[PDB]
Amino acid sequence: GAVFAVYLLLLCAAGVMFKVVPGGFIPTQDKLYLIGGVKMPEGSSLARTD
């Protein structure tokens, strides 16, 4: 009876785990490059951007 009591709580704990562990997809990983760029003021020429 006591082990079944613990099992019931552990089961509840399993439920909380799925709620406090953040959901994810693909872990971010170093893909060996970074993405840079720039937005210049509207109306700027390509020469200013360059």
Binding site: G43, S44, S45, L46, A47, R48
Partner: protein, 50 residues
């Protein structure tokens, strides 16, 4: 003093897509600071304009 074909030609001339170009585009001896697109309306929309 008009023909059907005069009327069709005038309608084709006066309801038409317009390419209006830009100011400050290449090539320039010194770098431009701005690139400015031009709008000119060519197409008609209402019975009144037609």
């Amino acid at each position: 003093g008009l023909t059907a074909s005069d009327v069709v030609t005038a309608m084709q001339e006066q309801n038409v897509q317009v390419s209006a170009g830009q100011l400050g585009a290449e090539p320039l001896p010194q770098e431009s600071d701005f690139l400015i697109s031009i709008n000119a309306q060519g197409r008609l929309h209402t019975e009144e304009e037609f």
